[PDB]
Amino acid sequence: VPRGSHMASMEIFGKTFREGRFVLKEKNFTVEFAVEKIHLGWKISGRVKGSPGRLEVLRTKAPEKVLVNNWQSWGPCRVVDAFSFKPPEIDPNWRYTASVVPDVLERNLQSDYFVAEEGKVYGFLSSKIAHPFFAVEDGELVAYLEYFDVEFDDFVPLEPLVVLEDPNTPLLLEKYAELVGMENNARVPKHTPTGWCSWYHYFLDLTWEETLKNLKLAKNFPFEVFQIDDAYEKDIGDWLVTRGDFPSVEEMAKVIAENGFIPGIWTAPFSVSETSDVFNEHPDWVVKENGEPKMAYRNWNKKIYALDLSKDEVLNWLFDLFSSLRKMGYRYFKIDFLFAGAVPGERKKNITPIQAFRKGIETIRKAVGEDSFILGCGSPLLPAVGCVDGMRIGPDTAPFWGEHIEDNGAPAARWALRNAITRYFMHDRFWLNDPDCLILREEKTDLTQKEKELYSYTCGVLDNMIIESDDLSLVRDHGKKVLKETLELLGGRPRVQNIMSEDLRYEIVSSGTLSGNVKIVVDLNSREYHLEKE
Ligand SMILES: OC[C@@]12C[C@@H]1[C@H](Oc1cc(F)cc(F)c1)[C@H](O)[C@@H](O)[C@H]2O
Ligand SMILES: [Mg+2]
């Protein structure tokens, strides 16, 4: 069992790579780590104390072509040329969706949690304290654990790192993900919800009158969940105060339940706008910069602040909120813009943003109980494993393909679908993947029948969550046929065979579906598919 030349060339915590047990006593920190052989490769694990800061874990030559992954739901997972990378201009209103360490990204190629090349996966198994990421720094791939200047008096566990090699790159990614699910006690529900969502037909203009119309019609469709999205609430943070023609949040649940659905509701639970009642009552409850409220992002034409999830007052408010929703009968919770809870800044306790983030989502889980389904959105991915049941893994879909939409996080069916493909390996390992809603209506849309089919059947072959978002008056024979045949493709184990493709054509197999072994070949440039079912 000789060492590859490329393995002898690798540095672990600054030392020449080799198997063994080691101690780095450095100026302001100490690390104790082991490098151990595992199936398909190596695992680097151990413990750290002191002020590790931005801690260098691994260094090796950058590959030419890398599969890079953004930390959160909406960001791209895609293959990039590592030598011709150009730093992006970052939208100052959405800085932290692009990166939790934006000094890196504005200079160098950044990949969060994992990175891959043909034949090789480097991936961290968890994000419980540090943010784990990779940067390409002058032709070199460097793995880091970011501790955000927090000091640790006693040892805390490192986030483990695996380095896996095999010529079957999809197999490596699936193995990586099974290791993540074990490290974090992932929730993989045995049942997948079907349902309806308001957002991608009505957007913020949903009325309760239109909601009631769809509630009646939804009885003709195979929907278990009826979820109300952003529209009902008076302000961001004030989740139990309604506007317009909506009744009370409790009354909405009762009407929905009386009509025989599981009620579902959208919140952005770590976000409070500058105008909200909660913020104006509790200016002290938010993350700060130089003592003042730190904008987390701008949306809805307002500055939006982040709740400080290190504060017990804030965690009690979250518990009471989600406990109050549970009492009302909600059992499906779409929790959005979660990245806000993990923004860098000043908190009451000197803990990391990731430690803060995890206390918040853990509180939500406790409050809604084991019988509620949590769907994460706009969220850091690895820190949420073990807490959420489903997770949005792409940018928003849209009632158009997005011919003039670039690959930059704006809504477009084409880029939403691409992420459902490139992150496919998380599915049934981290959680249920949510590829975002099907849009099957045949008026008030620019999608063709073929584009609807392509999106929906790819989602079914991937075994992903299937939720529809339409004015159900506008969905006729074709849309009902697409939904029916989609649900027939569920239940398998998918693999994207050519995960390193750069031309947006993918071959996808899934074994053991409700239609047997299936194969779809999809081309996201030509907008064509070819589906075979055994
Ligand atoms: O405000 C409601 C809403 C749009 C927000 C969220 O989609 C966004 C995704 C973004 F990158 C930015 C943004 F402002 C919104 C989410 O992903 C959607 O499904 C839906 O719930
Ligand atoms: Mg499954």
From Swiss-Prot:
Inhibited by hydrolysis product alpha-galactopyranose and to a lesser extent by beta-galactopyranose, its mutarotational product. Inhibited by synthetic cyclopropyl carbasugars. It comes from the Bacteria. Optimum temperature is 90-95 degrees Celsius when using synthetic substrate p-nitrophenyl-alpha-D-galactopyranoside. The half-life of thermoinactivation is 6.5 h at 85 degrees Celsius. It is an enzyme of class 3 (hydrolase). It catalyses: Hydrolysis of terminal, non-reducing alpha-D-galactose residues in alpha-D-galactosides, including galactose oligosaccharides, galactomannans and galactolipids. Gene3D superfamilies: 2.60.40.2760, Aldolase class I (3.20.20.70). Changing D336A: Less than 1% of the wild-type enzyme activity with p-nitrophenyl-alpha-D-galactopyranoside as substrate at 80 degrees Celsius. Optimum pH is 5.0-5.5 when using synthetic substrate p-nitrophenyl-alpha-D-galactopyranoside. GO terms for biological process: carbohydrate metabolic process; glycoside catabolic process. Keywords: Carbohydrate metabolism, Glycosidase, Hydrolase. One of its GO terms (molecular function) is protein homodimerization activity. Its EC number is 3.2.1.22. Changing F337A: Increased transglycosylating activity at high concentrations of p-nitrophenyl-alpha-D-galactopyranoside substrate, which could be useful in industry and medicine for the synthesis of different p-nitrophenyl-digalactosides. Substrate binds at W74, Y200, D229, D230, K334, I335, D336, C377, R392. The active site is at D336 (nucleophile), D396 (proton donor/acceptor). The keyword Transport does not apply. Belongs to the glycosyl hydrolase 36 family. Homodimer. Hydrolyzes the short-chain alpha-galactosaccharides raffinose, melibiose and stachyose. This is Alpha-galactosidase. It comes from Thermotoga maritima (strain ATCC 43589 / DSM 3109 / JCM 10099 / NBRC 100826 / MSB8).
